[PDB]
């Protein structure tokens, strides 16, 4: 009697500790190369910001008007998005973005500031709504008359909540010392900001910036997280954009950046800019910056795992 083993004509080459291209009966792939070019968002509260910028959800330019109090398991930033109507930007913008991506959305709340004999309806044709508007969650505080002066004010707010409050104010930088005074009066204007935690202060800086959105003025946006039962104070005298509402984080979420469509027909937990990586493979060669729950990125395209014996054909 005699005994042997099975074989095939067409085998599959694998690599070993010692060899490189040994043919086995059957091997299987270990590295995922397959991408699905959609955001597989089946089962998740998803928010596609489109033209709204993630930071705009806090301040409220018109693109973000429908995102001021959103709730999410999954947040999608788009390329066409913008945090801004009136030209300007945030200090520590990415830190803030990272916070917002895993916030689970935001709840808004009146800080309850009241103003004593100044203007309050500052606007522009950069923030277009019915006519010339401004950021929905903010207040463009102005000297009472079309030149006038600004009475060094003090406003304060206390986080009487169990969760940290996101506080956001803006500093205005005008085209010139000319316009800076028409808006706020003359003199070097100073804004200070503190807490049982925080320590900073600000001065404007008028001058000609290039024209963005049709404007040469800018707005410096700044932010701080107030703690439960901690108080925050705004010593200010001009060049100042006042926070109307404060923000609280809802819970937990994931934030991604993509340019592909959403599909509630597929389930995914590993995302990148070009879609969803649905795989059970331990590795992947698609995007090293893939995020969520993903296989480890490897530089190798293919790594074949032997699932059979040596193929020795006659």
């Amino acid at each position: 009697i005699c005994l042997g083993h099975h074989a095939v004509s067409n085998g599959t080459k694998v690599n070993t500790l010692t060899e490189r291209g040994v043919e086995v009966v059957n091997a299987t792939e270990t590295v995922e190369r397959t991408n699905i070019p959609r955001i597989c968002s089946k089962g998740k509260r998803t928010v596609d910001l489109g033209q709204c910028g993630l930071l705009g959800t806090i301040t409220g330019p018109p693109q973000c008007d429908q995102f001021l109090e959103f709730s999410a398991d999954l947040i999608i930033e788009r390329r066409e998005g913008s945090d801004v109507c009136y030209p300007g930007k945030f200090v520590n913008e990415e830190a803030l973005r990272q916070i917002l991506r895993e916030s689970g959305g935001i709840d808004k709340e009146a800080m309850g500031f009241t103003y004593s004999g100044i203007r309050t309806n500052g606007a522009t044709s950069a923030c277009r709504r019915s006519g010339s508007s401004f950021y929905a969650e903010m207040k463009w505080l102005l000297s009472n008359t079309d030149n006038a002066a600004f009475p060094q004010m003090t406003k304060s707010y206390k986080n009487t909540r169990k969760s940290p409050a996101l506080i956001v104010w803006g500093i205005h930088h005008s085209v010139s010392t000319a316009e800076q005074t028409k808006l706020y009066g003359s003199g070097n204007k100073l804004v200070t900001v503190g807490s049982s935690n925080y320590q900073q202060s600000f001065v404007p800086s008028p001058g000609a910036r290039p024209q963005v959105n049709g404007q040469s003025g800018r707005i410096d946006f700044h932010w701080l997280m107030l703690n439960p039962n901690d108080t925050v104070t705004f010593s200010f005298n001009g060049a100042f954009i006042a926070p109307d509402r404060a923000s609280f984080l809802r819970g937990k979420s994931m934030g991604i950046q993509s340019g592909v469509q959403v599909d509630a027909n597929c389930e995914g937990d590993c995302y990148h800019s070009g879609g969803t990586i649905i795989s059970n493979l331990p590795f992947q060669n698609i995007d090293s910056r893939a995020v969520g729950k993903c296989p480890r990125y490897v530089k190798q395209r293919s790594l074949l795992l032997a699932t059979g014996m040596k193929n020795v054909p006659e």
């Binding site: 009697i1 005699c2 005994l3 042997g4 083993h5 099975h6 074989a7 095939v8 004509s9 694998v14 690599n15 070993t16 500790l17 010692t18 040994v22 086995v24 299987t28 270990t30 590295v31 930033e77 390329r79 998005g81 913008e93 990415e94 973005r97 990272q98 991506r101 895993e102 994931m254 934030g255 950046q257 937990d269 800019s273 059970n280 493979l281 331990p282 590795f283 090293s288 910056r289 995020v291 969520g292 729950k293 993903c294 480890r296 990125y297 490897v298 530089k299 190798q300 790594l303 074949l304 795992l305 032997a306 699932t307 059979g308 014996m309 040596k310 193929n311 020795v312 054909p313 006659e314």
Partner: protein, 168 residues
């Protein structure tokens, strides 16, 4: 490595499609070739164990640390990239080693199961046969096909068939 598969056994049976390991004999009654479950199965139930161990679910979420629409500041940008490239080197290394190491073991495992099948049949025929040396066995008592079947399902009386092959 144990020396069976791609060892003294010149090659394998591209017609054996019933299992991984089997018997093909030569007695008077014509011809037959069969497969062995338990050997085949023990190799199947082990490669299958390797795969179920390599397909997993890291309940470990990773978040954006970078920005593609708005590049983060260079210094921190370069530290992040440097760090990410370093982790990639490790995983690419780990992956290549894991697969090579596993493939080596997978292959020497299949050898093992053959040699284990062989050297058990050899022990079942305590002297009523001898080893040719190419994985084939020469009986000296003309085994029938309810006798070859008796071997394959491990019954073959290790004595009651003796002298008929012993004396010869």
């Amino acid at each position: 490595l144990f020396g069976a598969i791609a060892g003294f056994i010149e090659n394998g049976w591209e017609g054996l499609i019933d299992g991984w390991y089997g018997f093909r004999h030569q007695n008077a009654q014509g011809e037959g070739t069969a497969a062995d479950y338990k050997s085949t199965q023990s190799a199947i139930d082990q490669i299958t164990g390797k795969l179920n161990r390599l397909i997993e679910k890291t309940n470990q979420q990773f978040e954006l640390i970078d920005n593609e629409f708005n590049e983060v500041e260079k210094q921190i940008g370069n530290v992040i990239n440097w760090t990410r490239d370093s982790i990639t080197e490790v995983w690419s290394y780990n992956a290549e080693l894991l697969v090579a190491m596993e493939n080596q073991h997978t292959i020497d495992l299949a050898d093992s199961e053959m040699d284990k099948l062989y050297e058990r049949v050899k022990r079942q025929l305590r002297e009523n046969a001898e080893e040719d040396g190419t994985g084939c066995f020469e009986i000296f008592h003309k085994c029938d096909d309810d006798c070859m079947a008796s071997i394959r399902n491990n019954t073959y009386d290790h004595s009651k068939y003796r002298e008929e092959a012993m004396q010869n």
